[PDB]
Amino acid sequence: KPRQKRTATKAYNVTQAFGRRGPEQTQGNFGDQELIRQGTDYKHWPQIAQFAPSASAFFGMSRIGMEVTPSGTWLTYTGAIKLDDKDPNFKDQVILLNKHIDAYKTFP
Amino acid sequence: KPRQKRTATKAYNVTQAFGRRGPEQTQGNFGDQELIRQGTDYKHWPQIAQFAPSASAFFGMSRIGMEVTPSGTWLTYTGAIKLDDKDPNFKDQVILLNKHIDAYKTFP
Ligand SMILES: [Cl-]
Ligand SMILES: [Cl-]
């Protein structure tokens, strides 16, 4: 499976499918130890997935680029997804996202 | 319906769902005239969607951040998807992606 189509689960976790969390531009930085170990099996995964873009929104909202480097050809992507301040779970969504963004920095 | 979960089609095109293509930091720049008016009805949509990330890969591969500005709270994302240069279809993949990246510059 191409890396972009992989689905993390307890049997193929975030580390196995997408590598260690870290600070380099080539590494992902999202996920506490519980989400890394369980992937889509994570109890709060659906609350995180509501922010993931559809294939249409991924190519409709993102700034797409093509880069040819010594390591190969890359499809770059950047963008921002607005949370809904009126959503009654807004305060829980902020806490949940804060719990996984750069959570690796505190792993024992 | 959240912008990230929208699906562009002939009835609800890329401009109506994700705004006019353009060069600004959080403005979409992908799509020629044909893709903008057809969205997922585009006859070559599958060869574009093969590069869209699953929800799991989006949070596993990307660099996720969160910003609070006067417009609201935003989930920022950045990353790069490696193309398989060993795939016999690689040249066609490069041609297809380059046809839509910044295509808006050649038309009103
Ligand atoms: Cl699709
Ligand atoms: Cl999912």
Residue numbers in the entry:
A (entry chain B), B (entry chain A): 257 to 364
What does the paper say about this structure?
The SARS-CoV-2 N protein binds to viral genomic RNA and oligomerizes around it to form a closed capsule that both protects the genome from antiviral responses and directs its packaging into new virions. The protein is comprised of five domains. There are two stable, proteolysis-resistant domains, the N-terminal RNA binding domain (N-RBD), which binds to virus genomic RNA, and the dimerization domain (N-DD), which facilitates protein oligomerization and has some nonspecific RNA binding activity.
The crystal belonged to the P212121 space group (cell parameters, a = 43.61, b = 122.32, c = 130.63) and was refined to 2.05 Å resolution. The asymmetric unit consisted of six polypeptide chains, which formed three homodimers. Each protomer contained 108 residues (257 to 364) that formed 5 α helices, α1 (269 to 275), α2 (288 to 295), α3 (301 to 306), α4 (310 to 318), and α5 (345 to 357); 3 η helices, η1 (258 to 262), η2 (296 to 298), and η3 (358 to 363); and 2 β-strands, β1 (319 to 325) and β2 (328 to 338), all of which were connected by five loops. One large interface is formed by a four-stranded, antiparallel β-sheet, comprised of the paired protomer β-hairpins (β1-β2–β′1-β′2) (best depicted between chains A and B). The structure has nine chloride ions bound, which were positioned on the positively charged helical face of each dimer. The overall topology observed in our structure was essentially identical to the 13 subsequently deposited structures of the SARS-CoV-2 N-DD. In the N-DD, the immunogenic peptides mapped to regions that projected away from the dimer interface and thus are exposed even in the dimerized form.
